[PDB]
């Protein structure tokens, strides 16, 4: 019986039960946390992974808090580099957690973890079977399993190659779905997990999930040193999971959208496979398997199955007062998508679509702040579909006109909505075939020994 | 009592019960798998085949994972070539599965399978009664039964001849129905199994099941180096079963659409017969029987019986922005097809047909992402049927006009829908009478012995 | 079982239960206090913090009344400076409370607190483990935990650095949400807590929560020595919690809106993190963690998650008779915000929106004095949204015009409402990376010893 820190009258509790049928998920709410659904999912995902791999196997745990791996009956060589600000408090809490159980419980190798902690304190560069101060790259502890839990600022092929050359044949990546970033949206929601993200460029928008703006009156033209001339997605993105914030790279998010098959080609070549094994409303687990040698061939295609609807639409907002249009993505519940099928046979207005969506939502099925952007999206889609039906072509025929040369061109129709309905698949041409592949200080090193 | 890993409140569970009446199918859901229906069907199909062939018989298992044939009381010479990326992990899991049962169970010849595996490890080119690294062609183990389970990238007559000259008299082929590829559709759905497939050319469509596109605004003519002038189905196709992807050849898919009778003519001639014995909403089992000698005569006709409706219609979508039309196939539930009979007596609009289909779907009978393409298909069909009734001809009379020569020509009417209703049969002129008919590396060969 | 001094038939009692699920909150009303909800929250917050940190730890308590920390089983070095007017009576009540328990209870170190009180009386400049007359800066008692409970007239980074250089690694700040002051509103409400605040400049308004005006008849122009020409938020603000008043600095309120990560850079550098762990309708607890050294990097972004709606709108009121417009903020219950989703698809009038809000309020969900300003706000927002939809732009395009130079300018649209819906996030660019960092008299010193 897995216990999840969520309210008993929570609708997510049912979806979570559907995502983990091998467990008896029971609500036991201890904290009023604002991203409780996300922690619930990641907790049940670690449970699944443990139940799935064989014991007596050692598990690297990248970017991890050792404290959350302290009462576990499994060899966790927690690779914990002191890079960000989240890490010294993680290490201090791991120390204060071993000390609170040094002479209480003896089914975990508590004293062995204390000894390895003090060994890595006496030597900052050493490697002990349960703890490491190196990065996932510079670590030297061989293992069979690697686990990436909510770690996105990582280049996937470099990190996976560096685990592969250390004997890791199985990696698990738990995190938010990378599909909204393969579509190059400017902003987006993972509404079930209270998560909103935006490009750094649209943080002064008015009506996306993650923004903040001012009252202005519509004054004279604010001067700029730069001409914009083009509002396009840039690398820097901000995620807010509840009220927790993190910056992230689009390049590193996209690196984790891996094809079904890829090849890691260095001094040691590996043939790797990525599958999505858990998928709940935007949050996924990817099981990656690495094998030595070059086997098979790569198409270079990554596929996303859609259990609920995925929308990416064009919205018009004001960023710092200036009215612009950019793309926005969200997840729509499958039952809402099913109940809109009949409405979407006609051209519907965003206002009628909004009142219909509000009727279908009754307790709410989807979050209401995303209903307008969804309504308008459905309205554009139903419109574009009608324009396809009216401008019907001949079967097997393209009306391409010439470029005064050996070149030909065609009209592109305007697409304001990508609507991926429940039970469809997204397929993207991503890269397979990859070839190219000391941060502590004293006052904390002193502090750790003060607890042991 | 066969146990299937599907939710107990699944409608597929009833159709599956209808497809396997000799079993007592019970839902026991362990995984939230996104193609659970497909694995359920293929599992019950292997059960059927085992209950159907006599024991003490040896069974070749083409393209197979030996791990899924390890707890079975039947002689499976699992021919397992290390061709694709799926194979090294299949072999590693077979090794890690024998080791987890080496001294547990003794009703299976566990230790004999261990000895045969490590004999094929000591010799990569040898043949042992339970394991093989050769292809289905280059294998040398004589058998009575062959089994192709989800094995499509094979030329059927070459493979069947190579099993026949080794004494195989009975082959079973489990897989998706090959009828949509005899019709040359560009894209298609097997909706009950969450499966969508597309030609490589239309992967940037917008509103098929397996596609992905961008937001654009309808900009200037994108330049091409090639003139298209013709959008026609090419050999390369992509299947997505849930989120699992595979490339497939149209030629090799079509090779498995076999006629009722065909002749394999080499040094040893065989008279072969193909029948469909299980058929559930797009997924089939073909029982093939091979007999030495030339017997009877071949018509060259393959027949598909339709328990539910089969649609192939012309849709207009945009591929990479360019509006085109191509053919799309799907399966419609028989009860939906039956309830549309009265509507389809009139000319109906796609919009009215869509609202009627949504009414008939209530819990849904068919998946909703296919309702628009089905609605439009039905409306074309009802329209074309009316145009047949108005342009009635004389009985036994063709109005063919002359070509200034000894040739004559006639008008072809436009056909935008092929609708094969429940209890009708498709018949295609296919080929009978066929005449023309070392992949391991060290680091994995080492790894296998590390588990024995 | 935590007991709260609020009426048993109070709706707040349920929200409070949701904010502290680890407790069994029971109403036990002793006082008819006009800010009972606020004291209930701050009481449950102190309980949470005690249950959360380890005992045997010493705990600074900034700006605190020692009397409210007298029956607690935890080392509270209550730093109590005699700065404001409430502090002599706080000290006298702490003395009169120790005297009423000197020979009653012995689980608290009562006589030790009496001895330390008399030690700080014998020496005004000394430091004893339970009492201090210094400011939070000039105190010299090292600790592990600091607690700021309803302490706003403090510069946050200076105070946190001064606790950090004394060994404090964990700080808790309990107080009203600082988000309305990051938005620079002129006046505002925290309605659940009966709290209204205003800029000193609009205290003579007519229809904000915290104002007072006269009857006039609309006489001749009142003369001013100053031209106003601009009504903008100034530093001085007045809060009224029930009937309790305090002046506040906008700068010091804004200093406590801390980013997720910041750096305190002095002689001793620290890497600090701020998270909101409790959040009920405008009242928050921020857990701050300080670590020695410079770790990671700072974005400079502070995020506010919105469980209920946050409005900032422009109102037109009369201040001292003169009709002006300024910004006003408030919190709208999430259920009211959800039930307005369908209404806000159209352009609605403030009058129709007001009658709809009065309908939705039935016992009231929100306080009624804020319904008109909310109604106005909603109607402006729904209007502005329509103007976004009609003036739709091209995707990724800004129409900026030139300034006869290398500069370009754009139109700003008028924004009269910032509406942050339930489950959205505010994100503000605040400062990380901080580098720049005897009040008693005799007649009371005499009085304190008279009680011991
Ligand atoms: Zn390590
Ligand atoms: Zn073989
Ligand atoms: Zn002090």
UniProtKB/Swiss-Prot annotation, chains A, B, C:
It is a lipid-anchor. A lipid is attached at residues 404, 406 (S-palmitoyl cysteine). It comes from the Viruses. Residues 293-437 are annotated as: Membrane-binding and oligomerization. Residues 26-257 form the Alphavirus-like MT domain. Changing residue 406 to A: Loss of palmitoylation. Palmitoylated by host palmitoyltransferases ZDHHC2 and ZDHHC19. Palmitoylation is increased by the interacton with host STING1. The active site is at residue 35. Changing residue 404 to A: Loss of palmitoylation. Signal peptide: none annotated. Zn(2+) binds at residues 77, 127, 132, 139. The record marks 35 as: Involved in the phosphoramide link with 7-methyl-GMP. Transmembrane segments: none annotated. It is found in: Host cytoplasmic vesicle membrane; Host cell membrane; Host cell projection, Host filopodium. The N-terminus binds a zinc ion which stabilizes this region. The C-terminus is disordered. Homododecamer. The enzyme forms a membrane-associated dodecameric ring with a central channel for the exchange of between the viral replication factories and the host cytoplasm. Interacts with non-structural protein 3. Interacts with RNA-directed RNA polymerase nsP4. Interacts with protease nsP2. Interacts with itself. Interacts with host STING1; this interaction results in inhibition of cGAS-STING signaling and increased levels of palmitoylation and protein stabilization of nsP1. Interacts with host TMEM45B; this interaction leads to viral replication inhibition. Cytoplasmic capping enzyme that catalyzes two virus-specific reactions: methyltransferase and guanylyltransferase. mRNA-capping is necessary since all viral RNAs are synthesized in the cytoplasm, and host capping enzymes are restricted to the nucleus. The enzymatic reaction involves a covalent link between 7-methyl-GMP and nsP1, whereas eukaryotic capping enzymes form a covalent complex only with GMP. This is mRNA-capping enzyme nsP1. It comes from Chikungunya virus (strain S27-African prototype) (CHIKV).
